[PDB]
Design an enzyme around this catalytic site. Sequence first.
Site, PDB file in Angstrom:
ATOM      1  N   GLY A 186       0.783  -1.224   0.000  1.00  0.00           N
ATOM      2  CA  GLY A 186       0.000   0.000   0.000  1.00  0.00           C
ATOM      3  C   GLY A 186       0.818   1.280   0.000  1.00  0.00           C
ATOM      4  O   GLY A 186       1.984   1.289  -0.403  1.00  0.00           O
ATOM      5  N   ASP A 241      -8.581   7.726  -0.906  1.00  0.00           N
ATOM      6  CA  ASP A 241      -7.760   7.048  -1.899  1.00  0.00           C
ATOM      7  C   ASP A 241      -8.328   5.730  -2.421  1.00  0.00           C
ATOM      8  O   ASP A 241      -7.610   4.739  -2.547  1.00  0.00           O
ATOM      9  CB  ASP A 241      -6.348   6.835  -1.338  1.00  0.00           C
ATOM     10  CG  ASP A 241      -5.367   6.389  -2.398  1.00  0.00           C
ATOM     11  OD1 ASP A 241      -5.489   6.858  -3.554  1.00  0.00           O
ATOM     12  OD2 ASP A 241      -4.473   5.575  -2.078  1.00  0.00           O
ATOM     13  N   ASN A 293      -7.880  -1.533  -3.276  1.00  0.00           N
ATOM     14  CA  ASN A 293      -8.354  -1.583  -1.894  1.00  0.00           C
ATOM     15  C   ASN A 293      -9.842  -1.864  -1.807  1.00  0.00           C
ATOM     16  O   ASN A 293     -10.522  -1.433  -0.888  1.00  0.00           O
ATOM     17  CB  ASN A 293      -7.989  -0.319  -1.095  1.00  0.00           C
ATOM     18  CG  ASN A 293      -8.403   0.962  -1.778  1.00  0.00           C
ATOM     19  OD1 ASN A 293      -9.532   1.099  -2.252  1.00  0.00           O
ATOM     20  ND2 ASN A 293      -7.489   1.928  -1.800  1.00  0.00           N
TER      21      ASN A 293
HETATM   22  C1  LIG Z   1      -3.854  -2.630  -0.297  1.00  0.00           C
HETATM   23  C2  LIG Z   1      -4.593  -3.422   0.762  1.00  0.00           C
HETATM   24  N1  LIG Z   1      -4.809  -2.988   2.005  1.00  0.00           N
HETATM   25  C3  LIG Z   1      -5.506  -3.925   2.731  1.00  0.00           C
HETATM   26  C4  LIG Z   1      -5.832  -3.573   4.179  1.00  0.00           C
HETATM   27  C5  LIG Z   1      -5.831  -5.107   2.025  1.00  0.00           C
HETATM   28  C6  LIG Z   1      -6.530  -6.332   2.350  1.00  0.00           C
HETATM   29  C7  LIG Z   1      -7.350  -6.541   3.528  1.00  0.00           C
HETATM   30  C8  LIG Z   1      -7.953  -7.827   3.658  1.00  0.00           C
HETATM   31  N2  LIG Z   1      -7.765  -8.793   2.728  1.00  0.00           N
HETATM   32  C9  LIG Z   1      -6.999  -8.511   1.676  1.00  0.00           C
HETATM   33  N3  LIG Z   1      -6.840  -9.570   0.723  1.00  0.00           N
HETATM   34  C10 LIG Z   1      -6.145  -9.741  -0.546  1.00  0.00           C
HETATM   35  C11 LIG Z   1      -5.398  -8.696  -1.177  1.00  0.00           C
HETATM   36  C12 LIG Z   1      -4.743  -8.925  -2.407  1.00  0.00           C
HETATM   37  C13 LIG Z   1      -4.809 -10.208  -3.055  1.00  0.00           C
HETATM   38  N4  LIG Z   1      -4.105 -10.452  -4.362  1.00  0.00           N
HETATM   39  C14 LIG Z   1      -4.145 -11.767  -5.069  1.00  0.00           C
HETATM   40  C15 LIG Z   1      -3.308  -9.394  -5.054  1.00  0.00           C
HETATM   41  C16 LIG Z   1      -5.569 -11.245  -2.405  1.00  0.00           C
HETATM   42  C17 LIG Z   1      -6.225 -11.011  -1.175  1.00  0.00           C
HETATM   43  N5  LIG Z   1      -6.396  -7.342   1.468  1.00  0.00           N
HETATM   44  S1  LIG Z   1      -5.204  -4.965   0.398  1.00  0.00           S
END
Ligand SMILES: Cc1nc(C)c(-c2ccnc(Nc3ccc(N(C)C)cc3)n2)s1
Length: 294
Positions: free
Chosen positions: A13, A123, A128
């Site tokens: 992030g 943002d 996200n």
């Molecule tokens: C920027 C982010 N900031 C937060 C707090 C994120 C978040 C929170 C909870 N689950 C996931 N899950 C998740 C994220 C990416 C992927 N990919 C396969 C890229 C799979 C699961 N991502 S992502």
Amino acid sequence: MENFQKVEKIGEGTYGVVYKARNKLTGEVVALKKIRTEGVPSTAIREISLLKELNHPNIVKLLDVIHTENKLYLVFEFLHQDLKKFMDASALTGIPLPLIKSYLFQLLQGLAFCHSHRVLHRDLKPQNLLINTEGAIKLADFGLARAFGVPVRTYTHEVVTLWYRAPEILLGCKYYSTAVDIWSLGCIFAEMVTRRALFPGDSEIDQLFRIFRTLGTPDEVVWPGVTSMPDYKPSFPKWARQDFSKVVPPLDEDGRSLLSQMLHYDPNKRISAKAALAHPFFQDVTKPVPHLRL
Ligand SMILES: Cc1nc(C)c(-c2ccnc(Nc3ccc(N(C)C)cc3)n2)s1
């Protein structure tokens, strides 16, 4: 922390890297966000802590905020996929409209909840926005901007995306409102429909000029006070507006109508999350199930 075992880098992030982690104790899996070291500002802690209370079905739950050794760790509820990836995987066919509409409706609810508590995201972006096998979609990293701030350059040595940034922010307005999230969601909405970013700017002015090229250069007629913005330049090229029928086809007119109201230059004329929910576009809204691959 010692109570978590990083399984994989789930992302990087603005404030820090995000990891999929396993609570060695509870056995629950979460997304752990570590934010880099003078001792972390007290104001941030107190602000971020309040976020632990704003819980909503369409907001990624913040379980705990860990501040040890003067470092920041945000522990979030884990979801299996972000919108970006889901979109890339839907590229060939495209996300079905009923699903696009369900996602928008849910995101709008989330926003309505956040905006009624006087909290904005600032943002929003495909990265996200998290989905699950349940057909639900959630907003992640809410309120983190008011905690610190998103620049134009990141520690990951990568690049900050401006593709969803509202014009009032690009024009220097320092006291923007909940309307900036509506603008971002509008850009995301259009992206889901066309399978291509609405305004893929590679710089701040390039970003501003792409917006202008499509919606037309803003003036005092359509945006009272625009010419008084800190970064407004009388020398901005004068572009004519383009019909929405060319901006987001084959979206139906109800959708086009809603998108248009989400993309109004004047933050005050921009429809609110609550009002967006009463739009005729959601008259036939349902909740389909996504065909996710994990
Ligand atoms: C920027 C982010 N900031 C937060 C707090 C994120 C978040 C929170 C909870 N689950 C996931 N899950 C998740 C994220 C990416 C992927 N990919 C396969 C890229 C799979 C699961 N991502 S992502």
